[PDB]
Amino acid sequence: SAYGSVKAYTNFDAERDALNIETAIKTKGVDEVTIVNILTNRSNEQRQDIAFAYQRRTKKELASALKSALSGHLETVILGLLKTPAQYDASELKASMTDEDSLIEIICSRTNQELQEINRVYKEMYKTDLEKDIVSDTSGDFRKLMVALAKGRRAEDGSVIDYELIDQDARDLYDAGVKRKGTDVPKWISIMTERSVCHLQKVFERYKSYSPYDMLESIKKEVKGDLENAFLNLVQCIQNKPLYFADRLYDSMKGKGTRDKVLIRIMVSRSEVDMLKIRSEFKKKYGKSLYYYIQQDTKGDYQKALLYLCGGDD
Ligand SMILES: [Ca+2]
Numbered sequence: 001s002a003y004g005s006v007k008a009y010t011n012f013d014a015e016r017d018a019l020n021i022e023t024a025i026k027t028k029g030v031d032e033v034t035i036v037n038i039l040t041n042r043s044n045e046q047r048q049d050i051a052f053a054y055q056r057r058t059k060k061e062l063a064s065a066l067k068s069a070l071s072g073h074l075e076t077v078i079l080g081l082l083k084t085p086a087q088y089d090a091s092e093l094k095a096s097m098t099d100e101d102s103l104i105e106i107i108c109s110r111t112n113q114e115l116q117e118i119n120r121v122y123k124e125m126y127k128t129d130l131e132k133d134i135v136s137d138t139s140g141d142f143r144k145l146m147v148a149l150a151k152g153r154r155a156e157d158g159s160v161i162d163y164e165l166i167d168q169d170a171r172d173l174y175d176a177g178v179k180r181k182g183t184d185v186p187k188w189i190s191i192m193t194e195r196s197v198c199h200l201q202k203v204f205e206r207y208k209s210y211s212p213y214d215m216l217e218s219i220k221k222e223v224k225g226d227l228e229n230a231f232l233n234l235v236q237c238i239q240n241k242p243l244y245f246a247d248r249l250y251d252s253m254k255g256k257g258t259r260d261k262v263l264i265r266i267m268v269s270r271s272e273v274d275m276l277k278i279r280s281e282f283k284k285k286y287g288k289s290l291y292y293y294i295q296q297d298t299k300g301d302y303q304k305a306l307l308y309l310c311g312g313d314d
């Protein structure tokens with residue numbers, strides 16, 4: 001929040017913003033520049049106030065009006081920015097249902113409290129439980145892992161550290177995998193879904209005291225396929241959530257064109273949470289800024305919108 005790139009605008013005036021956006025929408029050809037400039041420089045909560053004031057004045061819902069007025073990747077970004085975080089995450093989950101990397105990315109990186117609100121909003125929008133949908137769309141151990149993660153019931157022992165449990169969990173992960181001939185997948189799932197993220201960072205550290213390979217290397221040796229890929233993503237997300245996002249951003253822009261669904265989703269969803277840490281990890285790893293990469297990979301008003309969500313560079 002302190003680590004978000006998008007901050008609450010000072011001296012906020014919803015009605016001013018709604019008049020200005022209406023004018024922009026009705027400009028011949030559409031004044032996209034103004035729409036992007038405003039909405040990318042307001043908090044999500046402020047955008048809700050703007051939507052409310054817009055409908056009151058015009059008798060049109062802002063999101064509907066913008067669906068009609070905008071298109072292409074610009075439209076995706078702007079409509080995503082208008083959704084509340086829970087609505088946005090719920091709708092991105094639904095869209096990922098199959099895209100296992102994206103389901104992990106969303107589910108691994110939200111708080112318990114965000115996950116409860118996502119579950120509630122998902123049922124409301126889609127009239128089915130998120131967990132029922134996951135069970136439908138997935139199978140085997142990846143289904144078990146996803147179901148467990150989606151419940152959003154990681155332990156929350158403030159950060160009162162339990163050094164004994166850290167050690168026991170680390171030994172248990174080792175005994176369940178690298179120490180023995182097969183792999184006890186339910187034990188890995190249990191530990192990695194039921195403990196807090198800070199606890200698990202310490203477990204993975206302590207783990208190295210017992211295992212000749214770190215957690216990521218152990219995963220590579222112990223499991224295969226979709227489930228291997230899922231655990232690797234999950235462990236990265238736990239060990240360093242900003243670097244995880246930075247790597248997903250870099251990968252979204254590599255080579256020819258862009259995986260715009262991923263890029264958009266990250267820039268919208270992490271804009272008010274940790275985009276400054278993501279930037280910092282990205283620059284540290286890749287040498288140039290996130291801003292520089294977005295700028296080289298996208299164009300037009302869509303690019304401008306994403307560069308505002310990035311927020312600049314250091
Ligand atoms: Ca235009």
Ligand SMILES: [Ca+2]
Pocket residue numbers: 176177178179180181182183222
């Ligand atoms: Ca083994």
Ligand SMILES: [Ca+2]
Pocket residue numbers: 252253254255256257258297
């Ligand atoms: Ca590219």
